[PDB]
Design a protein around this ligand. Sequence first.
Ligand SMILES: COC(=O)[C@H](O)[C@@](C)(O)[C@@]12O[C@]13c1cc(O)c4c(c1N[C@H]2C#C/C=C\C#C[C@H]3O)C(=O)c1c(ccc(O)c1O)C4=O
Ligand SMILES: COC(=O)[C@H](O)[C@@](C)(O)[C@@]12O[C@]13c1cc(O)c4c(c1N[C@H]2C#C/C=C\C#C[C@H]3O)C(=O)c1c(ccc(O)c1O)C4=O
Lengths: 121, 121
Amino acid sequence: HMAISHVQLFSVPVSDQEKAKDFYVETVGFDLLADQPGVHGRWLQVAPKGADTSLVLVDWFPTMPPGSLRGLLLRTDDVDADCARLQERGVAVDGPKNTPWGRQAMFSDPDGNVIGLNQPS
Amino acid sequence: HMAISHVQLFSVPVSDQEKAKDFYVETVGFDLLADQPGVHGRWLQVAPKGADTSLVLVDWFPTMPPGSLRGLLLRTDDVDADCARLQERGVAVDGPKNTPWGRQAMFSDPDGNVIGLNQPS
Ligand SMILES: COC(=O)[C@H](O)[C@@](C)(O)[C@@]12O[C@]13c1cc(O)c4c(c1N[C@H]2C#C/C=C\C#C[C@H]3O)C(=O)c1c(ccc(O)c1O)C4=O
Ligand SMILES: COC(=O)[C@H](O)[C@@](C)(O)[C@@]12O[C@]13c1cc(O)c4c(c1N[C@H]2C#C/C=C\C#C[C@H]3O)C(=O)c1c(ccc(O)c1O)C4=O
């Protein structure tokens, strides 16, 4: 019986990392956990405050070109307010629409990776 | 401040969903959270028991070809016992090795997506 407790982190492919940083931290409001050298380049690691699973903003996997990532869904406690905030902050939002699984919206980062919001029922 | 609490889920590109599911559920030991019809096909969702962030094994994003995903790291309380459990079930493992950020190991799913394991020091 495996001792795996959770996903520590996964990777999002970006091109300009400084730009991605400011987007995920200032615009989307993630916490900046680490920004330092890593083995294949600059390790840039972000997460919603207090979450167990963080995201790494990388540029070193050929198999994941910048902006390729889809099907990422972020849980929020208030999808209307978050959409209002994003729009305020100069991001294009698609939604919020209702769905069988909660109230949802979509937007994209500066490379074109597509991020969902979901507030469950 | 944004009302985003955590990443609800993210996507892992696969070809055969029935193989993938058996791999993640039987080999890697995840719980099966859903196996049901979705928008763009079959919705198949796996997570470590207890965990906030879950994984969807999808086939339908052209920008994420099967087996293309990298830089996924799973947190575990016993990487040594995990690597030996994986090995006895037919999985080629690279590790464990000590790194600055914990004891770490690596393996691929049937499609070639590279999963990491990490037990912190
Ligand atoms: C082909 O797969 C790989 O290159 C690796 O085997 C990985 C993906 O698995 C990997 O070893 C990598 C790796 C590189 C890093 O620079 C770091 C890390 C690292 N672990 C694996 C993970 C990953 C996500 C993108 C990557 C890269 C590898 O270069 C870290 O884990 C790490 C780091 C910093 C603070 C942490 O708390 C931490 O956990 C960190 O800088
Ligand atoms: C069509 O919209 C999109 O392209 C977007 O990618 C999302 C983010 O909006 C996406 O709409 C998708 C989507 C399809 C689904 O079939 C589901 C869902 C779904 N939401 C978004 C999510 C995603 C990850 C891969 C996908 C694709 C879209 O088809 C769900 O969110 C969902 C589902 C089942 C139980 C849940 O608790 C749940 O949250 C579920 O079946």
